[PDB]
Coordinates of C-alpha atoms and ligand atoms in Angstrom, one line a residue:
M1 CA 0.0 0.0 0.0
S2 CA 3.0 2.3 -0.6
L3 CA 2.8 4.5 -3.7
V4 CA 3.9 4.5 -7.3
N5 CA 7.6 4.7 -8.2
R6 CA 9.5 7.0 -10.6
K7 CA 9.4 4.6 -13.6
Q8 CA 6.2 3.1 -12.4
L9 CA 4.6 6.5 -13.1
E10 CA 6.8 7.1 -16.2
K11 CA 5.1 4.1 -18.0
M12 CA 1.7 5.3 -16.8
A13 CA 2.0 8.7 -18.5
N14 CA 3.9 7.5 -21.6
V15 CA 2.7 9.2 -24.8
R16 CA 4.2 7.8 -28.0
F17 CA 6.5 9.9 -30.2
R18 CA 6.3 13.2 -28.1
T19 CA 9.1 14.8 -26.1
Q20 CA 9.3 15.0 -22.2
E21 CA 8.9 18.6 -21.1
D22 CA 11.0 20.1 -18.2
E23 CA 8.0 20.4 -15.9
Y24 CA 7.1 16.8 -16.4
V25 CA 10.7 15.6 -15.6
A26 CA 10.4 17.6 -12.3
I27 CA 7.5 15.3 -11.1
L28 CA 9.5 12.1 -11.5
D29 CA 12.6 13.8 -9.9
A30 CA 10.6 14.8 -6.8
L31 CA 8.9 11.5 -6.6
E32 CA 12.1 9.3 -6.4
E33 CA 13.6 11.4 -3.6
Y34 CA 10.4 11.2 -1.7
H35 CA 11.1 7.4 -1.5
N36 CA 14.5 8.1 0.0
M37 CA 12.9 10.3 2.7
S38 CA 12.7 7.6 5.5
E39 CA 14.8 9.8 7.8
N40 CA 12.5 12.9 7.5
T41 CA 9.8 13.9 9.9
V42 CA 6.1 13.3 9.1
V43 CA 5.7 17.0 8.2
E44 CA 8.7 17.0 5.8
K45 CA 7.1 14.1 3.8
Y46 CA 3.8 15.9 3.5
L47 CA 5.5 19.0 2.2
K48 CA 7.3 16.9 -0.4
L49 CA 3.9 15.4 -1.3
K50 CA 2.4 18.9 -1.6
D51 CA 5.2 19.9 -4.0
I52 CA 4.9 16.9 -6.3
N53 CA 1.2 18.0 -6.5
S54 CA 2.2 21.7 -7.1
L55 CA 4.4 20.5 -10.0
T56 CA 1.8 18.2 -11.5
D57 CA -1.0 20.9 -11.7
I58 CA 1.7 23.2 -13.3
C59 CA 2.6 20.5 -15.9
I60 CA -1.1 20.3 -16.9
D61 CA -1.6 24.1 -16.9
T62 CA 1.2 24.7 -19.5
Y63 CA 0.1 21.7 -21.6
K64 CA -3.7 21.7 -21.8
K65 CA -3.4 19.7 -25.1
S66 CA -1.2 16.9 -23.7
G67 CA -1.8 13.1 -23.8
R68 CA -0.2 12.7 -20.4
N69 CA -3.1 14.6 -18.7
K70 CA -5.1 11.4 -18.0
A71 CA -2.3 9.6 -16.1
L72 CA -1.2 13.0 -14.6
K73 CA -4.7 13.4 -13.1
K74 CA -4.8 9.7 -11.9
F75 CA -1.5 10.3 -10.2
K76 CA -2.9 13.4 -8.3
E77 CA -5.3 10.9 -6.6
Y78 CA -2.6 8.5 -5.6
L79 CA -1.0 11.4 -3.8
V80 CA -4.2 11.9 -1.7
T81 CA -4.1 8.2 -0.7
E82 CA -0.5 8.6 0.3
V83 CA -1.3 11.5 2.7
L84 CA -3.9 9.3 4.3
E85 CA -1.3 6.5 4.6
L86 CA 1.3 8.9 6.0
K87 CA -1.3 10.1 8.6
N88 CA -2.5 6.7 9.9
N89 CA 0.8 4.8 10.1
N90 CA 3.0 7.4 11.6
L91 CA 1.7 8.2 15.1
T92 CA 3.3 10.1 18.0
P93 CA 2.2 10.4 21.7
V94 CA -0.5 13.0 22.4
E95 CA 0.5 15.3 25.3
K96 CA -1.5 14.4 28.4
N97 CA -3.4 17.7 28.7
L98 CA -7.2 18.2 29.1
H99 CA -8.3 21.7 28.0
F100 CA -11.6 23.3 29.0
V101 CA -12.7 26.9 28.5
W102 CA -15.0 29.0 30.6
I103 CA -14.8 32.7 29.9
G104 CA -17.1 35.7 30.5
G105 CA -18.2 35.1 34.1
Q106 CA -18.0 32.8 37.0
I107 CA -17.8 29.0 36.4
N108 CA -21.0 27.2 37.7
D109 CA -20.9 24.0 39.8
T110 CA -22.4 22.0 36.9
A111 CA -19.3 22.5 34.7
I112 CA -16.9 21.7 37.6
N113 CA -18.9 18.5 38.3
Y114 CA -18.6 17.5 34.7
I115 CA -14.9 18.5 34.6
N116 CA -14.3 16.5 37.8
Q117 CA -15.4 13.2 36.2
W118 CA -12.6 13.6 33.7
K119 CA -10.3 14.3 36.6
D120 CA -11.4 11.3 38.5
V121 CA -10.6 8.8 35.7
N122 CA -7.6 10.6 34.2
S123 CA -5.2 11.2 37.1
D124 CA -2.2 11.0 34.7
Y125 CA -3.6 14.0 32.6
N126 CA -2.9 17.7 33.4
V127 CA -6.0 19.8 33.3
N128 CA -6.4 23.5 32.3
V129 CA -9.7 25.3 32.7
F130 CA -9.2 28.5 30.7
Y131 CA -10.7 31.8 31.9
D132 CA -10.0 35.4 31.2
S133 CA -9.1 37.4 34.4
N134 CA -10.0 40.8 32.8
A135 CA -13.5 39.7 31.7
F136 CA -15.6 38.1 34.4
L137 CA -18.4 40.6 33.8
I138 CA -19.3 40.0 30.1
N139 CA -22.0 37.4 31.0
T140 CA -23.4 39.9 33.5
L141 CA -23.2 42.7 30.8
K142 CA -25.1 40.6 28.2
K143 CA -27.8 39.3 30.7
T144 CA -28.5 42.8 32.0
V145 CA -28.8 44.2 28.4
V146 CA -30.9 41.3 27.1
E147 CA -33.3 41.6 30.1
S148 CA -33.5 45.4 29.7
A149 CA -34.4 44.8 26.1
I150 CA -36.9 42.0 27.1
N151 CA -38.7 44.4 29.4
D152 CA -38.7 47.3 26.9
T153 CA -40.2 45.2 24.1
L154 CA -43.0 44.0 26.4
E155 CA -43.6 47.6 27.5
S156 CA -44.1 48.3 23.8
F157 CA -46.7 45.5 23.3
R158 CA -48.7 45.0 26.6
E159 CA -52.1 46.4 25.5
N160 CA -51.7 43.9 22.6
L161 CA -50.4 41.0 24.6
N162 CA -53.6 39.0 23.9
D163 CA -53.5 39.5 20.1
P164 CA -53.4 39.3 17.3
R165 CA -50.0 38.1 16.2
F166 CA -47.7 39.9 18.5
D167 CA -46.2 36.4 18.5
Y168 CA -42.7 35.2 19.4
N169 CA -41.3 36.1 15.9
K170 CA -42.4 39.7 16.3
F171 CA -41.1 39.9 19.9
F172 CA -37.5 38.7 19.0
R173 CA -37.5 41.1 15.9
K174 CA -38.3 44.2 18.1
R175 CA -36.1 43.0 20.9
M176 CA -33.2 42.7 18.3
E177 CA -33.5 46.4 17.5
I178 CA -33.3 47.4 21.1
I179 CA -30.4 45.0 21.8
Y180 CA -28.5 46.3 18.8
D181 CA -28.8 49.9 20.1
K182 CA -27.7 49.0 23.6
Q183 CA -24.8 47.0 22.4
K184 CA -23.7 49.8 20.1
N185 CA -24.0 52.2 23.0
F186 CA -21.7 50.0 25.1
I187 CA -19.2 49.3 22.2
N188 CA -18.9 53.1 21.7
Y189 CA -18.3 53.5 25.4
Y190 CA -15.6 50.8 25.5
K191 CA -13.8 52.4 22.6
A192 CA -14.0 56.0 24.0
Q193 CA -12.5 54.6 27.3
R194 CA -9.7 52.5 25.7
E195 CA -8.7 55.6 23.6
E196 CA -8.6 57.7 26.8
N197 CA -7.1 55.2 29.2
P198 CA -5.3 52.4 27.2
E199 CA -4.6 50.8 30.7
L200 CA -8.2 50.0 31.6
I201 CA -9.0 46.3 31.6
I202 CA -12.3 45.0 30.2
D203 CA -14.0 44.6 33.6
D204 CA -13.2 48.2 34.7
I205 CA -15.0 49.6 31.6
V206 CA -17.9 47.1 32.1
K207 CA -18.6 47.6 35.8
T208 CA -18.4 51.4 35.4
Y209 CA -20.8 51.0 32.5
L210 CA -23.2 48.8 34.5
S211 CA -23.1 51.3 37.3
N212 CA -23.7 54.4 35.0
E213 CA -26.4 52.8 32.9
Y214 CA -28.1 50.1 34.9
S215 CA -27.6 51.2 38.5
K216 CA -25.4 48.2 39.5
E217 CA -23.3 48.6 42.6
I218 CA -19.5 48.5 41.9
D219 CA -18.9 46.9 45.3
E220 CA -21.1 43.9 44.5
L221 CA -19.5 43.5 41.1
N222 CA -16.1 43.6 42.7
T223 CA -17.1 41.0 45.2
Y224 CA -18.3 38.8 42.2
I225 CA -15.0 39.3 40.4
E226 CA -13.1 38.2 43.6
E227 CA -15.3 35.1 44.1
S228 CA -15.0 34.0 40.4
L229 CA -11.2 34.4 40.6
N230 CA -11.0 32.3 43.7
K231 CA -13.3 29.6 42.4
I232 CA -11.4 29.2 39.1
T233 CA -8.0 29.2 40.9
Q234 CA -9.4 26.3 43.1
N235 CA -10.3 24.5 39.8
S236 CA -7.2 24.2 37.5
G237 CA -7.8 27.8 36.3
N238 CA -5.5 29.0 33.5
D239 CA -5.6 32.6 32.5
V240 CA -5.9 33.8 28.9
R241 CA -4.0 36.9 30.0
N242 CA -0.9 34.8 30.7
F243 CA -1.1 32.8 27.5
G244 CA 1.5 34.8 25.6
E245 CA 1.6 33.1 22.2
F246 CA -2.2 33.7 22.1
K247 CA -2.1 37.3 23.4
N248 CA 0.5 38.2 20.7
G249 CA -1.0 36.2 17.8
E250 CA -3.2 37.5 15.0
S251 CA -6.3 35.9 16.6
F252 CA -6.4 37.9 19.8
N253 CA -8.2 40.9 18.3
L254 CA -10.8 38.4 16.9
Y255 CA -11.2 36.7 20.3
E256 CA -11.8 40.1 21.8
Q257 CA -14.2 41.1 19.1
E258 CA -16.3 38.1 20.1
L259 CA -15.8 38.6 23.8
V260 CA -16.3 42.4 24.1
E261 CA -18.5 43.5 21.1
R262 CA -20.5 40.4 20.1
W263 CA -20.8 38.8 23.6
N264 CA -20.4 35.4 22.0
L265 CA -18.4 33.3 24.4
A266 CA -18.8 30.2 22.3
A267 CA -17.1 32.0 19.3
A268 CA -14.4 33.3 21.7
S269 CA -14.0 29.7 23.0
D270 CA -13.6 28.4 19.4
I271 CA -10.8 30.8 18.7
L272 CA -8.9 30.1 22.0
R273 CA -9.3 26.3 22.0
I274 CA -7.6 25.7 18.6
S275 CA -4.7 27.9 19.9
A276 CA -4.4 26.0 23.1
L277 CA -4.1 22.8 21.0
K278 CA -1.5 24.3 18.6
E279 CA 0.6 25.7 21.5
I280 CA 0.4 23.0 24.2
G281 CA -1.1 19.9 22.6
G282 CA -3.7 17.4 24.0
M283 CA -7.4 17.0 24.1
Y284 CA -10.0 19.9 24.1
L285 CA -13.5 19.3 25.6
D286 CA -16.5 21.5 26.0
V287 CA -17.6 21.6 29.7
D288 CA -20.8 19.7 28.8
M289 CA -18.9 16.6 27.8
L290 CA -18.4 13.6 30.0
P291 CA -16.0 10.6 29.8
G292 CA -16.8 7.6 27.6
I293 CA -18.9 4.8 29.2
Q294 CA -17.0 1.5 29.4
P295 CA -17.8 -0.6 26.2
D296 CA -18.9 -3.7 28.1
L297 CA -20.8 -2.0 31.0
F298 CA -24.4 -2.2 29.7
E299 CA -23.6 -5.1 27.4
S300 CA -26.2 -7.2 29.2
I301 CA -29.1 -4.7 28.8
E302 CA -30.6 -4.6 25.3
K303 CA -32.0 -1.4 23.8
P304 CA -35.8 -1.9 23.5
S305 CA -37.3 -1.2 20.0
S306 CA -39.5 1.7 21.2
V307 CA -36.4 3.9 21.8
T308 CA -34.1 6.1 19.7
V309 CA -30.4 5.2 19.7
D310 CA -30.0 8.8 21.0
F311 CA -32.6 8.4 23.7
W312 CA -30.7 5.3 24.8
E313 CA -27.4 7.1 25.1
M314 CA -29.1 9.8 27.2
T315 CA -30.7 7.1 29.5
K316 CA -27.3 5.3 29.9
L317 CA -25.9 8.4 31.5
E318 CA -29.0 9.2 33.6
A319 CA -28.9 5.7 35.1
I320 CA -25.3 6.1 36.1
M321 CA -26.2 9.4 37.8
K322 CA -29.4 8.3 39.5
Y323 CA -27.6 5.3 41.1
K324 CA -24.0 6.4 41.6
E325 CA -25.0 10.1 42.0
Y326 CA -21.6 11.3 40.7
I327 CA -23.2 14.5 39.4
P328 CA -25.8 16.0 41.7
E329 CA -29.1 17.3 40.3
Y330 CA -28.6 15.4 37.1
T331 CA -31.9 14.8 35.2
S332 CA -33.7 11.4 35.2
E333 CA -36.3 12.7 32.7
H334 CA -35.8 10.0 30.1
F335 CA -34.8 7.1 32.4
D336 CA -38.1 7.4 34.2
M337 CA -40.0 6.7 31.0
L338 CA -38.6 3.1 30.8
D339 CA -40.3 0.0 32.1
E340 CA -40.0 -1.4 35.6
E341 CA -38.1 -4.3 34.0
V342 CA -35.7 -2.2 32.1
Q343 CA -35.0 0.2 35.0
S344 CA -34.4 -2.8 37.2
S345 CA -31.7 -4.2 34.9
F346 CA -29.8 -0.9 35.1
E347 CA -29.8 -0.9 38.9
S348 CA -28.8 -4.6 38.8
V349 CA -25.8 -3.7 36.6
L350 CA -24.9 -0.5 38.5
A351 CA -24.9 -2.7 41.5
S352 CA -22.0 -5.2 40.8
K353 CA -19.7 -2.2 40.2
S354 CA -18.1 -0.3 43.1
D355 CA -15.4 1.8 41.4
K356 CA -16.0 4.8 39.1
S357 CA -13.4 3.2 36.8
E358 CA -15.8 0.3 36.2
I359 CA -18.2 2.8 34.7
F360 CA -16.2 5.4 32.9
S361 CA -13.2 4.6 30.7
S362 CA -9.9 6.4 30.6
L363 CA -8.1 8.1 27.8
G364 CA -4.8 6.5 28.8
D365 CA -2.0 6.7 26.2
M366 CA -3.2 8.3 23.0
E367 CA -1.4 8.8 19.7
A368 CA -2.1 11.0 16.6
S369 CA -0.4 12.2 13.4
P370 CA 1.8 15.2 13.5
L371 CA -0.4 16.3 10.6
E372 CA -3.8 16.0 12.2
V373 CA -6.4 17.4 14.5
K374 CA -9.0 14.8 15.5
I375 CA -12.6 15.9 15.9
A376 CA -15.7 14.5 17.5
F377 CA -18.7 13.4 15.4
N378 CA -22.5 13.4 15.9
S379 CA -25.4 12.6 13.5
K380 CA -25.0 16.0 11.8
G381 CA -21.3 15.5 11.0
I382 CA -18.1 16.7 12.6
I383 CA -18.4 18.9 15.8
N384 CA -15.6 20.7 17.7
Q385 CA -16.9 19.9 21.2
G386 CA -14.1 17.3 21.3
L387 CA -10.6 17.7 19.7
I388 CA -7.4 15.8 19.9
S389 CA -4.0 17.1 18.5
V390 CA -0.3 16.9 19.2
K391 CA 1.5 20.1 19.9
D392 CA 2.0 22.2 16.7
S393 CA 0.1 19.8 14.5
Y394 CA -0.1 20.8 10.8
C395 CA -3.9 20.9 10.9
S396 CA -4.0 23.0 14.0
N397 CA -2.0 25.6 12.0
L398 CA -4.4 25.2 9.0
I399 CA -7.4 25.7 11.3
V400 CA -6.0 28.8 12.8
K401 CA -5.3 30.2 9.3
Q402 CA -8.9 29.3 8.2
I403 CA -10.5 31.1 11.1
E404 CA -8.4 34.2 10.6
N405 CA -9.2 34.3 6.9
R406 CA -12.9 33.8 7.5
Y407 CA -12.8 36.8 10.0
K408 CA -10.9 38.9 7.5
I409 CA -13.7 38.4 5.0
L410 CA -16.4 39.1 7.6
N411 CA -14.8 42.2 9.1
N412 CA -14.0 43.6 5.6
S413 CA -17.8 43.9 5.0
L414 CA -19.0 44.3 8.5
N415 CA -16.8 47.1 9.8
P416 CA -17.6 49.7 7.0
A417 CA -21.3 48.9 7.6
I418 CA -21.0 49.5 11.4
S419 CA -18.8 52.6 11.2
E420 CA -21.7 54.4 9.5
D421 CA -23.8 55.1 12.6
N422 CA -27.2 53.5 11.6
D423 CA -29.9 51.4 13.3
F424 CA -30.1 47.6 13.2
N425 CA -32.0 47.3 9.9
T426 CA -29.9 49.7 7.8
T427 CA -26.7 48.2 9.2
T428 CA -27.9 44.7 8.3
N429 CA -28.8 45.8 4.8
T430 CA -25.5 47.6 4.1
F431 CA -23.6 44.6 5.6
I432 CA -25.5 42.1 3.4
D433 CA -25.2 44.2 0.3
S434 CA -21.4 44.3 0.9
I435 CA -21.1 40.5 1.6
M436 CA -23.1 40.0 -1.6
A437 CA -20.8 42.2 -3.7
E438 CA -17.7 40.2 -2.4
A439 CA -19.3 36.8 -3.0
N440 CA -18.2 34.4 -5.8
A441 CA -18.5 30.8 -6.8
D442 CA -15.7 29.8 -4.3
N443 CA -17.2 31.4 -1.2
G444 CA -20.9 31.4 -1.9
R445 CA -22.5 29.3 0.8
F446 CA -20.2 30.7 3.4
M447 CA -21.2 34.3 2.4
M448 CA -24.9 33.4 2.7
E449 CA -24.2 32.2 6.2
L450 CA -22.4 35.4 7.3
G451 CA -25.4 37.8 6.7
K452 CA -27.1 36.8 10.0
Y453 CA -23.9 37.6 12.1
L454 CA -25.3 40.7 14.0
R455 CA -28.0 38.5 15.6
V456 CA -25.9 35.6 17.0
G457 CA -27.1 34.7 20.4
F458 CA -30.0 37.1 20.3
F459 CA -32.4 35.6 17.8
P460 CA -33.6 32.0 17.2
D461 CA -31.7 29.7 14.8
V462 CA -28.7 31.9 14.2
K463 CA -25.6 29.7 13.8
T464 CA -23.1 31.9 12.0
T465 CA -20.4 30.8 14.4
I466 CA -20.3 27.3 12.9
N467 CA -19.1 28.8 9.6
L468 CA -16.7 31.3 11.0
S469 CA -14.8 29.7 14.0
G470 CA -16.5 26.3 14.3
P471 CA -16.8 22.9 12.5
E472 CA -16.6 24.4 9.0
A473 CA -13.1 25.9 9.6
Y474 CA -12.1 22.3 10.5
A475 CA -13.6 20.7 7.3
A476 CA -11.9 23.5 5.3
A477 CA -8.6 22.7 7.0
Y478 CA -8.9 18.9 6.3
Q479 CA -9.6 19.8 2.6
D480 CA -6.6 22.1 2.7
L481 CA -4.6 19.1 3.9
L482 CA -6.0 16.6 1.4
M483 CA -5.8 19.0 -1.5
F484 CA -2.2 20.3 -0.9
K485 CA -3.5 23.9 -0.7
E486 CA -4.5 26.5 1.8
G487 CA -7.7 28.6 2.0
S488 CA -10.5 26.2 0.9
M489 CA -13.8 28.1 1.1
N490 CA -15.9 25.6 -0.9
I491 CA -16.2 22.3 1.1
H492 CA -16.5 19.3 -1.3
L493 CA -15.4 16.6 1.1
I494 CA -18.0 13.9 2.0
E495 CA -18.5 12.0 5.2
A496 CA -16.0 9.3 4.2
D497 CA -13.2 11.8 3.9
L498 CA -13.9 13.3 7.3
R499 CA -14.2 9.9 9.0
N500 CA -10.4 9.8 8.8
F501 CA -10.2 12.5 11.4
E502 CA -12.8 11.2 13.9
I503 CA -12.2 10.7 17.6
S504 CA -13.6 7.2 18.3
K505 CA -17.1 7.4 19.9
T506 CA -15.9 5.5 22.9
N507 CA -13.7 8.4 24.1
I508 CA -16.5 10.8 24.8
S509 CA -20.1 10.7 26.0
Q510 CA -21.6 13.5 24.1
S511 CA -25.3 12.8 24.9
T512 CA -25.2 14.8 28.2
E513 CA -27.9 16.9 29.9
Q514 CA -25.9 20.1 29.4
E515 CA -25.3 19.3 25.7
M516 CA -29.0 19.5 25.2
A517 CA -29.1 23.2 25.9
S518 CA -26.9 25.6 23.9
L519 CA -25.3 28.5 25.6
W520 CA -24.8 30.7 22.5
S521 CA -27.8 29.8 20.4
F522 CA -31.5 28.7 20.7
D523 CA -34.0 27.0 18.4
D524 CA -37.6 28.1 17.6
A525 CA -39.4 25.9 20.1
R526 CA -37.1 27.3 22.9
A527 CA -37.7 30.9 21.6
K528 CA -41.5 30.2 21.8
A529 CA -41.3 28.9 25.3
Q530 CA -39.0 31.9 26.4
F531 CA -41.5 34.4 24.9
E532 CA -44.3 32.9 26.9
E533 CA -42.3 32.8 30.1
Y534 CA -41.3 36.4 29.7
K535 CA -44.9 37.5 29.2
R536 CA -46.0 35.7 32.4
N537 CA -43.1 37.3 34.4
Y538 CA -43.9 40.7 33.0
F539 CA -47.6 40.2 33.9
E540 CA -46.8 38.9 37.4
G541 CA -43.6 40.9 38.2
Ligands
LIG601 O1 -20.9 31.8 29.0 C1 -20.3 31.0 28.3 C2 -20.9 30.2 27.4 C3 -20.2 29.3 26.6 N1 -18.8 29.2 26.8 C4 -18.0 28.3 26.0 O2 -18.6 27.8 24.7 C5 -18.5 26.4 24.7 C6 -19.6 25.8 23.9 O3 -20.9 26.0 24.5 P1 -22.1 25.0 24.2 O4 -21.8 23.6 24.5 O5 -23.3 25.6 24.8 O6 -22.2 25.2 22.6 P2 -23.0 24.1 21.7 O7 -22.5 22.7 21.9 O8 -24.6 24.2 22.0 O9 -22.8 24.6 20.2 C7 -18.7 26.0 26.1 O10 -18.2 24.7 26.3 C8 -17.7 27.0 26.8 O11 -16.3 26.6 26.5 C9 -18.1 30.0 27.7 O12 -16.9 29.9 27.9 N2 -18.9 30.9 28.5
LIG602 O1 -18.6 26.6 16.7 C1 -19.8 26.9 17.5 C2 -20.0 25.8 18.4 O2 -20.1 24.6 17.6 C3 -20.3 23.3 18.2 O3 -21.7 23.1 18.3 C4 -19.6 23.1 19.6 O4 -20.4 22.3 20.4 C5 -19.1 24.3 20.3 O5 -17.9 24.0 21.0 C6 -18.8 25.6 19.4 O6 -18.7 26.7 20.2
LIG603 MN1 -22.5 21.7 23.8

């Protein structure tokens, strides 16, 4: 399963009676010396593969009317196969680090209780829980602002709360306008202050703002900052403000854009996590992820037919937490819908086990390609809630580059829109017009997905983050890898290509309670339920 030799290819692209051009002879040359490269690093072999590819597309280019073009194009495919061979066969130890991120406010007990499960079965792994010591008040800032906007929109309706269609669609639309205006009022303040006193940290600007505009007590905010700092210190805290390579890189301004202006802590988390992986190596996990259940644990209990495979994965966890109680206040919602007979079997199995290690598996020694970042999977494809990479992996670099390039395209259209000082609607329309003018056949779908950006976290079903800093940057990077290029914007890879980068399902339990509620986004059914709750509160409060 090695790949084609110098004269093995030379008989493949043999065209009768016609001379061998310089750029063709370069392919063969580079190909032979690749086979003498069993001294070189895994990266050096990829870069030799990239170049053979860069010479082959340059041979075709110059000779559009060449008989070699059929074999020259079949060779380009053999090169892809070889990357996949280079990746799977040449594995190095993954650094024993677990990376979590919680930024924007205090860490809640739930996250720590999830994190501690990883701690309890991975004593040989170092754990970082990343926080930003300048920015404990963003979550407070957003919540105050959203609630102020909730109350203002309801003040607008009220005499029309009954009817007709002052429905949940209309509410979130109006609320968006108010939110935009408040956010832009804060952003303007932030920038006025940073220009005046460049020494002021995020939280200083924020608490002064909350005091001036929402009558919050600075003393209580200060107390909150001090408690949050103490709590994260007690829990493997690691400060973004001491991560120097991150502070000084080209992604820090983007990270702050998301933190300070957009209040999207998931997008800020996306930008930081890949950088942690690039700089330290190891395994990244969202705080709503729990260890993998032992393969042979529930092997005696059979999934009944009246149950989703995903319902079953949820119940497996809930049965562990009902009987072993590892995580307090874990839901039993789905477990309780089972039979007597089926609930009995779970207790009976969760009985013969005494150690947490008989329930949850350990990561132990892991290995990956110096080329790759491994990514978790769910039914909708790849997902960056789990990631594995060795320090300075080739992909970690390609993913960083993808994210920065995606932001460069966004900010190029967004910023001129914003720096005209208009309301939500006009700014949206200018922004979209601009995105539309810069769109082309290469970046089309991605551009369509960018136009909802001003609404992220504030309106139902707005997922822009996925295309900017999330899973799509990862797919683009894998395509960069497999196509010997950089800057893919048009994803043509299918499921089978991406499967090469999967973390095995046994290493993570993804079907957790906290996974089932998104911190940066919300669907329509949730938006409807929220609307109705807010009306009641307004009526009763
Ligand atoms: O206030 C917040 C909210 C989210 N996050 C980060 O964003 C990640 C993704 O959150 P979530 O799992 O809700 O996103 P989802 O899986 O629904 O896309 C979390 O794990 C945290 O790392 C954060 O740091 N602070
Ligand atoms: O990229 C946006 C989000 O996408 C995914 O759903 C991940 O669960 C989360 O870690 C990330 O923040
Ligand atoms: Mn999640």
